[PDB]
Write an enzyme that holds these catalytic residues in place. Sequence first.
Site, mmCIF file in Angstrom:
data_model
loop_
_atom_site.group_PDB
_atom_site.id
_atom_site.type_symbol
_atom_site.label_atom_id
_atom_site.label_comp_id
_atom_site.label_asym_id
_atom_site.label_seq_id
_atom_site.Cartn_x
_atom_site.Cartn_y
_atom_site.Cartn_z
ATOM 1 N N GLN B 11 1.358 -1.232 -0.343
ATOM 2 C CA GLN B 11 0.246 0.008 0.036
ATOM 3 C C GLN B 11 0.878 1.205 0.423
ATOM 4 O O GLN B 11 0.872 2.104 -0.869
ATOM 5 C CB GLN B 11 -1.050 0.066 1.632
ATOM 6 C CG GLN B 11 -2.339 0.597 0.452
ATOM 7 C CD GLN B 11 -2.700 1.259 2.562
ATOM 8 O OE1 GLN B 11 -2.477 2.533 2.228
ATOM 9 N NE2 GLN B 11 -2.978 0.274 3.161
ATOM 10 N N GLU B 64 -5.393 -6.342 -1.786
ATOM 11 C CA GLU B 64 -6.182 -5.510 -1.365
ATOM 12 C C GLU B 64 -6.685 -4.467 -2.105
ATOM 13 O O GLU B 64 -5.731 -4.156 -2.744
ATOM 14 C CB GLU B 64 -5.559 -4.899 0.471
ATOM 15 C CG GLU B 64 -6.903 -4.632 0.919
ATOM 16 C CD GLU B 64 -7.673 -3.296 0.273
ATOM 17 O OE1 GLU B 64 -6.810 -2.546 0.160
ATOM 18 O OE2 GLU B 64 -9.503 -3.017 0.464
ATOM 19 N N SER B 133 6.494 -1.393 1.645
ATOM 20 C CA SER B 133 6.807 -0.822 2.779
ATOM 21 C C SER B 133 7.123 -2.061 3.814
ATOM 22 O O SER B 133 6.615 -3.099 2.740
ATOM 23 C CB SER B 133 5.075 -0.631 3.055
ATOM 24 O OG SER B 133 5.505 -0.265 4.520
ATOM 25 N N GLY B 137 2.021 -7.160 5.419
ATOM 26 C CA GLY B 137 2.493 -8.415 5.222
ATOM 27 C C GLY B 137 2.250 -8.793 3.659
ATOM 28 O O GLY B 137 3.595 -9.298 3.548
ATOM 29 N N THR B 138 1.780 -8.609 3.190
ATOM 30 C CA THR B 138 1.543 -8.274 1.938
ATOM 31 C C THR B 138 2.765 -8.141 1.133
ATOM 32 O O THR B 138 3.446 -8.237 -0.026
ATOM 33 C CB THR B 138 -0.006 -8.205 1.168
ATOM 34 O OG1 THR B 138 0.717 -8.497 -0.017
ATOM 35 C CG2 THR B 138 -0.106 -6.729 1.074
ATOM 36 N N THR B 172 2.737 1.691 13.790
ATOM 37 C CA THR B 172 1.998 1.629 13.563
ATOM 38 C C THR B 172 0.690 0.137 13.627
ATOM 39 O O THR B 172 -0.356 -0.284 14.406
ATOM 40 C CB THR B 172 1.682 2.108 12.501
ATOM 41 O OG1 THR B 172 1.851 2.553 11.216
ATOM 42 C CG2 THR B 172 -0.220 2.039 11.676
ATOM 43 N N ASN B 199 10.061 6.428 8.388
ATOM 44 C CA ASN B 199 9.364 7.649 8.680
ATOM 45 C C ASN B 199 9.605 8.806 9.984
ATOM 46 O O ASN B 199 9.374 9.705 10.355
ATOM 47 C CB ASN B 199 7.676 7.073 8.987
ATOM 48 C CG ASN B 199 7.144 6.169 7.984
ATOM 49 O OD1 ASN B 199 7.774 5.770 6.916
ATOM 50 N ND2 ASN B 199 6.724 4.912 8.348
ATOM 51 N N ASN B 221 5.235 10.930 0.880
ATOM 52 C CA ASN B 221 5.295 10.771 -0.910
ATOM 53 C C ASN B 221 6.348 12.073 -1.312
ATOM 54 O O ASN B 221 6.685 10.923 -2.281
ATOM 55 C CB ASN B 221 4.287 10.228 -1.150
ATOM 56 C CG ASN B 221 3.281 9.036 -0.498
ATOM 57 O OD1 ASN B 221 2.575 8.672 0.403
ATOM 58 N ND2 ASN B 221 4.138 8.465 0.654
ATOM 59 N N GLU B 247 26.674 2.797 -12.440
ATOM 60 C CA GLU B 247 27.738 3.244 -10.966
ATOM 61 C C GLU B 247 26.718 3.447 -10.015
ATOM 62 O O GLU B 247 27.744 4.522 -9.240
ATOM 63 C CB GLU B 247 28.192 4.458 -12.215
ATOM 64 C CG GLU B 247 28.548 4.451 -13.412
ATOM 65 C CD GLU B 247 28.779 5.505 -14.074
ATOM 66 O OE1 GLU B 247 29.091 5.977 -13.602
ATOM 67 O OE2 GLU B 247 29.229 5.690 -15.210
HETATM 68 N N1 LIG Z 1 6.077 6.140 5.070
HETATM 69 C C1 LIG Z 1 5.239 6.186 4.510
HETATM 70 N N2 LIG Z 1 5.289 4.513 5.370
HETATM 71 C C2 LIG Z 1 3.498 3.729 4.338
HETATM 72 C C3 LIG Z 1 2.845 4.352 4.180
HETATM 73 N N3 LIG Z 1 1.712 3.677 4.489
HETATM 74 C C4 LIG Z 1 2.236 2.801 5.458
HETATM 75 N N4 LIG Z 1 3.139 2.653 5.361
HETATM 76 C C5 LIG Z 1 3.897 1.600 6.856
HETATM 77 O O1 LIG Z 1 3.409 0.433 6.393
HETATM 78 C C6 LIG Z 1 3.158 -0.244 7.243
HETATM 79 C C7 LIG Z 1 2.230 -1.389 7.106
HETATM 80 O O2 LIG Z 1 2.209 -1.622 5.849
HETATM 81 P P1 LIG Z 1 1.253 -0.703 4.753
HETATM 82 O O3 LIG Z 1 2.085 -0.494 3.613
HETATM 83 O O4 LIG Z 1 0.063 0.511 5.066
HETATM 84 O O5 LIG Z 1 -0.008 -1.670 3.928
HETATM 85 P P2 LIG Z 1 0.989 -3.522 3.328
HETATM 86 O O6 LIG Z 1 2.144 -2.863 2.827
HETATM 87 O O7 LIG Z 1 -0.173 -3.442 1.641
HETATM 88 O O8 LIG Z 1 0.688 -4.821 4.159
HETATM 89 P P3 LIG Z 1 -1.105 -4.827 4.613
HETATM 90 O O9 LIG Z 1 -1.176 -3.708 5.434
HETATM 91 O O10 LIG Z 1 -1.382 -6.727 4.705
HETATM 92 O O11 LIG Z 1 -1.822 -5.444 3.350
HETATM 93 C C8 LIG Z 1 2.694 0.698 8.632
HETATM 94 O O12 LIG Z 1 3.009 0.395 9.630
HETATM 95 C C9 LIG Z 1 3.582 2.353 7.595
HETATM 96 O O13 LIG Z 1 4.517 2.804 8.828
HETATM 97 C C10 LIG Z 1 3.023 5.801 3.648
HETATM 98 O O14 LIG Z 1 2.794 5.968 2.398
HETATM 99 N N5 LIG Z 1 4.136 6.778 3.396
HETATM 100 MG MG LIG Z 2 -1.848 -3.578 3.398
#
Ligand SMILES: Nc1nc2c(ncn2[C@@H]2O[C@H](COP(=O)(O)OP(=O)(O)OP(=O)(O)O)[C@@H](O)[C@H]2O)c(=O)[nH]1
Ligand SMILES: [Mg+2]
Lengths: 206, 432, 439, 430, 51, 202
Positions: B11, B64, B133, B137-138, B172, B199, B221, B247
């Site tokens: 995500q 998702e 990220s 999980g995914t 989070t 972050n 972002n 390089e």
């Molecule tokens: N820096 C930054 N971190 C993010 C952002 N969105 C989510 N995260 C981090 O990603 C972690 C959770 O993973 P997500 O990216 O939200 O969701 P996912 O990677 O698809 O994994 P799932 O939630 O299982 O679907 C959170 O603890 C956030 O710290 C973002 O837009 N910027």
């Molecule tokens: Mg997610």
Amino acid sequence: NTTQMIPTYQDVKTGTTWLGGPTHVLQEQHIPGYKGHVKGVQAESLHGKTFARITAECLNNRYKSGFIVDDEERFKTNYQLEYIRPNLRNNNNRQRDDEVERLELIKAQLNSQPKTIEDVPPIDRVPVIGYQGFRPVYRHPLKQVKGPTEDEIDFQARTILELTKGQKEAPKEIPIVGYTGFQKGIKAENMFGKTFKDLSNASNRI
Amino acid sequence: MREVISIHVGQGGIQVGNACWELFCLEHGIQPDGQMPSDDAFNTFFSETGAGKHVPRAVFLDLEPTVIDEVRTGTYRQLFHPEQLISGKEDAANNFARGHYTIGKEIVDLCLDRIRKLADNCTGLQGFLVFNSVGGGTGSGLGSLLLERLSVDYGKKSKLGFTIYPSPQVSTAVVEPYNSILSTHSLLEHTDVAVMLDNEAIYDICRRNLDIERPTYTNLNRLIAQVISSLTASLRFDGALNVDITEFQTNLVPYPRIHFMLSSYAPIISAEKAYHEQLSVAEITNSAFEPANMMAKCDPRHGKYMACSMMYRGDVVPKDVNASIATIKTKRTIQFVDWCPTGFKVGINYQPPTVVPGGDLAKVMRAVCMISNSTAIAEVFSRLDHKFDLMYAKRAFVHWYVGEGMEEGEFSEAREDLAALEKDYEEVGIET
Amino acid sequence: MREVISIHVGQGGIQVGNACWELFCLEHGIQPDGQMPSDKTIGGGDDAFNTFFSETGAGKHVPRAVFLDLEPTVIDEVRTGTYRQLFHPEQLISGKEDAANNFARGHYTIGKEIVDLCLDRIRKLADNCTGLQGFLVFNSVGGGTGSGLGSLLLERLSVDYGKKSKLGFTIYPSPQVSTAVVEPYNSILSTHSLLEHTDVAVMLDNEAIYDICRRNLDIERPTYTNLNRLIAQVISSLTASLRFDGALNVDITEFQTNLVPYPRIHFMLSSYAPIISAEKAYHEQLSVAEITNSAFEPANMMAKCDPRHGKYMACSMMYRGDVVPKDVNASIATIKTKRTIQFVDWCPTGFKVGINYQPPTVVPGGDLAKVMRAVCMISNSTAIAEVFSRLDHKFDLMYAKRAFVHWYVGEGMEEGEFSEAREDLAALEKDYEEVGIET
Amino acid sequence: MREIVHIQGGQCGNQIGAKFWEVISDEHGIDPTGTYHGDSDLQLERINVYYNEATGGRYVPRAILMDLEPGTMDSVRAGPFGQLFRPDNFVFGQTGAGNNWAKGHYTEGAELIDSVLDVVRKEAEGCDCLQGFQITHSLGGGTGSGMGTLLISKVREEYPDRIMETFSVVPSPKVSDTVVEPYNATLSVHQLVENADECMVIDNEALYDICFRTLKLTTPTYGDLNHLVSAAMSGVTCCLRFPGQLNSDLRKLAVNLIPFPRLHFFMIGFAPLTSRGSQQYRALTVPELTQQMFDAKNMMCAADPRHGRYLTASALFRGRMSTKEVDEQMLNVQNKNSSYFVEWIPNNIKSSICDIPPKGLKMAVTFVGNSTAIQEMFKRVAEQFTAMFRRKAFLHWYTGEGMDEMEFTEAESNMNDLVSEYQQYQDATA
Amino acid sequence: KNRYKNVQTNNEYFQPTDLVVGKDVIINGYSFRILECDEYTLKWFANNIVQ
Amino acid sequence: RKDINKMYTQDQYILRFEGKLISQNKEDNHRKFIISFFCGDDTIMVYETADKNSGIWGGKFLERMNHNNPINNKPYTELDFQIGEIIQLGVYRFQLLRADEYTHKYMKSKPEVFKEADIEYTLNHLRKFATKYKSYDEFMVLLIKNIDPNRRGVIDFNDFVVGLRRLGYNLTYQEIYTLMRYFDLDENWKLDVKSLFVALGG
Ligand SMILES: Nc1nc2c(ncn2[C@@H]2O[C@H](COP(=O)(O)OP(=O)(O)OP(=O)(O)O)[C@@H](O)[C@H]2O)c(=O)[nH]1
Ligand SMILES: [Mg+2]
Ligand SMILES: Nc1nc2c(ncn2[C@@H]2O[C@H](COP(=O)(O)OP(=O)(O)OP(=O)(O)O)[C@@H](O)[C@H]2O)c(=O)[nH]1
Ligand SMILES: Nc1nc2c(ncn2[C@@H]2O[C@H](COP(=O)(O)OP(=O)(O)O)[C@@H](O)[C@H]2O)c(=O)[nH]1
Ligand SMILES: [Mg+2]
């Protein structure tokens, strides 16, 4: 008051008196040391503004009196009273207007391209091919667009040209960064991510 | 005829990829529909359709559907290919085993298929960027599986991963240490370069410099997008000292094991006060090495430096760059490792950074981004190791991974690999 | 290519620095928003504003000064006032809690969390300068936060930069007129801290300039800002030699080579002439000899000390206007001939003379008038020990019964810290009386 | 920034706050509906000191009204500007203490104080950076004199670094509208001296005498007395809300006005005061203000300050003034009356200037003077308390709820020792 | 229960004639609209207001 | 004796001009110079600006000092400092190319000493020239045909001046600048011959 009123521009330019000046021909003074009542020294208790200017203020009757004051001249602070620009010898910024103009022109170019009334290309009548969603069947398939009406496009237009050398003022005036005062309601309504520069403008605008 | 392909999984990866993609289109003058406003250089990131529109060289993966649905209902509906936006049905629900063994195994097939289609068109493929990220999980599972598959398929092709590790104390989720350690173990022997983008540091930068006290994900972002643009500018724009992506693996990694490095950018400033100073190259390169401006929440003063590669864009001058580097070497609070007499790689690019209208950044004629590899990054490994140990001592949450195909001893070998990595860090950090 | 960095601490420091910077902007023609005017569009010549300002590349200029305070009223107030667009926004460092006249609070409790930012800004301002000459520091000594921050900043700077010159313009409390009641304590501690750490220390006692305003300017009801304008004019006179052409130039580096015979002996007091309003200024000649006689007149001394009670050590005096060396030497001959002022035997000569062509500039709404001739004098002499002696007596009266001491004890300072300061001041008095004896 | 909350308990504290916040609303231009209607920008520059913000752009008190009998708050809620107060901030009991210090300090107050402590904890956490706490209460009522002191003790236990200032209305023997005044006044001061950072004492006879001799009104009212107190105690904190030549916060006053930790009970005063028929033949000058200010009669306590030596004094001049006349006049009055100032503390005067005077006035003075003349109030309250206690009359009431005469004995010992040590510095010589 | 000034009439005190059912009234910055009044008030009107 | 009242009355009035240097060497015919006139005691200062990446060590060229014109043996005054004139300081000769907009405001705001900048005076000059020709209308039509050979309606300064010199009557470059700047509608130095025509007569 005498300091900013007297040595006027006409007097300083091609005149008898310069900046400091023996400004005695223009209006009356009391030539330092003098024993007598000057109608304004023991009552109003003037500050700074050397004895000549003290007597001049009393004699020319700009003045103020009474035990009651009303609001406006009540609420002044010494900082602005003393350090009030340079004033009188030779006769501030134009800003806040250029960026507000940038603001309305951005919204203008934004709402000037929503593609009103079936002007969109043949594609985007329907959503993207792989869309998931719901896609209800008992509904009109093609999307219908209302779009802004020509009158509101013009609504922005005379305004944005009027801000270019027009009657409406550059609005408000703001502090720069470190101002710790209330600043009128950033906390009541969040306005969370809005660039403290622009936060000042929006919050003061309401 | 030089191209790079972008993978956007998770995500956070998707919503930062949106961020970088408005920037690239705006910088090349691409209209949101992809059609030209009647005006080669863009060839690195796009591919021609024959007449008119362009297809970005990106692929988005998720299980998702909500974020992909948002993208496909946003203003960029007709920019991306409509079957390169691969969306699943059941989310991994922050479970690494689910995203590594149960669901994503049947989606990586079409991910690799789309990569095949996008790559056979290309001719001088430089490499791949991957966004994910780690605290998801995914994201972690799909990223790991794709890295393993791309290593066994491609091999020597360069791959660069922009991982956003969780903050040392601000988090989070509650089970992100597990999948963080697992993903680190997975990618350690599979990726070529990995950038630290936690972050908390970027939050502090937004609070301090841009004067934003309630920032959201969009600003973060945007800054990551600007960093990507700074890295890839020399690839598509003329400059006095241009570099390729290739390089890097010969310049910022001393040993095959050490390839996790941390970034920083300058200047970052608001429209209030960008115009009140010179923006001199010397002072911007000092702000770059200023420790509190690091994009990762790590203290460089606690460790030695191995390497620093710095990109300048704008109207900088080689005299000025040399003079500033001399001052940096003179300064005593910054020290390098003994077996590295010189550690600076420099690149220069002519085209000034582009500024997004309605954004936070102002327009500045000079900018610099540093990518530094230093010994101090061991602290994040140590703290996450402690976090993982405190959990795994009592076997908390272990069933949520065991029941979905994870073997019990899988955590122990990852822990051993992390300990070996730390011992390698200690060994390389000492002088001879 | 020669610059100097200014530091202001305390609300007194802020109020004096504002008066200095309005006058500097008027001197260099800087309108408050930063441009020269918008009405003149060539410029590009006679770069002298580089002494105090820095060019942004196109348009305005940035002052080379830093403001420090812990109570935010004055910082918000100036950030709201007329020079809002002039100063760089994060140069006016402001804390949250005031020290409340406690030197301990500002030196060991709350100043440590602001000194990091202060030194960061100091570095960010120092790196741009290439031939930076030195540092000026302004502080009211009778205030807790000002004293503590000044002391600890001097401590840090003396080791961070080392040999670079620093000049401290301290405003000591009047012998009998005081605003607070615990000023002897923090004054003594600050003096002990700065004694081994400031190169030059100039006395700025308020009662003397109050008397000057009463007598010469004919103001029977003055404020702080008139005194601030006077001090600002003194600052401009001191620094004009470095940004204006003259027949005989003097640098700040030419003061610790001419004014202080011994490293311990670096406290001196100044005077200025003429002080007269145009309402009576233009009636008189304003000759160099008479303005210099007025300058050495004891009642015109800007600090409340009697020079007739002690010998003179050194005198650095400077003219601005249309002065000539013939009149300069003719005045100095009369000064040395006149008996009522006596030098020490081991200094047959003690005069350093500076010449500048630029006449003083007059501020709108001010008290002073415009005169083609001006003289400013800075003397180091043995008569200054009286204020130290009386302040010692005051501090002893307080410390005899351990009054107010718990306030400093509970803020982290050791109890015997007062004893070492007392011994240092006693040793300084002994040093002064030993230097003042004839051979 | 450096904001402060208001905590009021008891009927006396409630009615003090009722007029004080009317004064503050008038000063800042706030309507009784909570909508700003001011004229200058400064009316909003330090508005966060006493006011929080609500949705819709309205302003809201940071005051907690807390009492064991709800009649007083039900009456004050109906008052002008009374709808500003948060209904949630009101906390009330259902029994009443009957002017019993024991009942208000051990039985009902202990169980009731949980909710008010929770809400004060909420308010303290809410503010950016707290400055301290101010309390207003009367020492003649049992519920106030006990429960407010217990609240003070608990508050000090949680916030040792914050500043405490309390407005104590001690019961003077001349207007003694209850007979149990000595017991609860003594039990209150015993706890007050140990934990309160600083206190201002106020006397009803002093207010009556001031109103009759200076302002010369036929029928003084509790409203007028409350207005006097409100203006006087707003004067000290006005310089915290408005700029001036020399800013001086309550922490600075505490640092500069108490030589010793246990001597923190002051006598205060406000100037100028003039009658309606006499308000026009004077012109306010610094000499007039200071001569009317240092008069014995103008003090808000019946204690005669010329019967002892001033340990120290502080004056906040308020209005557009400058410093020469102020400090020269203060030096003049210090030199003229050297007999009334103890010698080993030379220059025992603090002077501060605020730029914004009161509405309708040019110049004003708020005075706080620490002098040894306050001892006689403790003398009389102690002699009355021992007259009460030697016969053990009215004592079964107190002893019926868990506490005994050992508390009375230790309290009387404490105040006698306080009096002795406080008068010790009176005769001290250098 | 206290006498209150009236903004509607030269900052004067309220008068029984000011209380008018059917018409709005202002009481210390509060807007009221009287809907119904007691028939005792009706009687007192009918016996006194008639002039 | 020194004129102190003059110092006090006109200290603030400072005239800034831009110029180009006519003199000996061919090498130094390109660099630019900024002339400052202080009317406190009729003193002249010259500064030399150095554009970036030039190699010239630009700096202060002549200091604040007062000197007179050699032939007339009289000190220079504000009257002599008009743009487009040649002034010789010592051995160095300067052509006054441009002046500051503040300087132009001063020029126009003080008449009866600066006659050539006064628009009505210049127009009266040009119109009273027309006594040589037989008729006013034929004079005007010859005028327009000579300034505009192809009748475009807009010209350049060089075309205007060369046409006027072809006419032969003597206007100085100062009056030429006055007319040319006044009749520029959008401030780009393009003359509006139609406005000039209607101003002369229609
Ligand atoms: N820096 C930054 N971190 C993010 C952002 N969105 C989510 N995260 C981090 O990603 C972690 C959770 O993973 P997500 O990216 O939200 O969701 P996912 O990677 O698809 O994994 P799932 O939630 O299982 O679907 C959170 O603890 C956030 O710290 C973002 O837009 N910027
Ligand atoms: Mg997610
Ligand atoms: N001459 C002059 N003296 C000032 C001025 N402001 C303050 N002072 C002196 O400073 C002393 C008190 O210290 P302040 O400067 O007011 O405050 P501070 O030094 O910042 O220390 P704090 O009081 O703890 O905040 C007074 O006794 C004054 O003599 C001023 O504007 N002009
Ligand atoms: N300033 C002031 N004091 C009052 C007022 N009413 C009563 N008091 C004082 O309060 C004391 C009695 O307080 P009390 O009613 O017992 O307080 P309670 O126990 O908290 O209800 C008396 O000694 C009065 O002097 C008032 O309206 N204003
Ligand atoms: Mg202060």
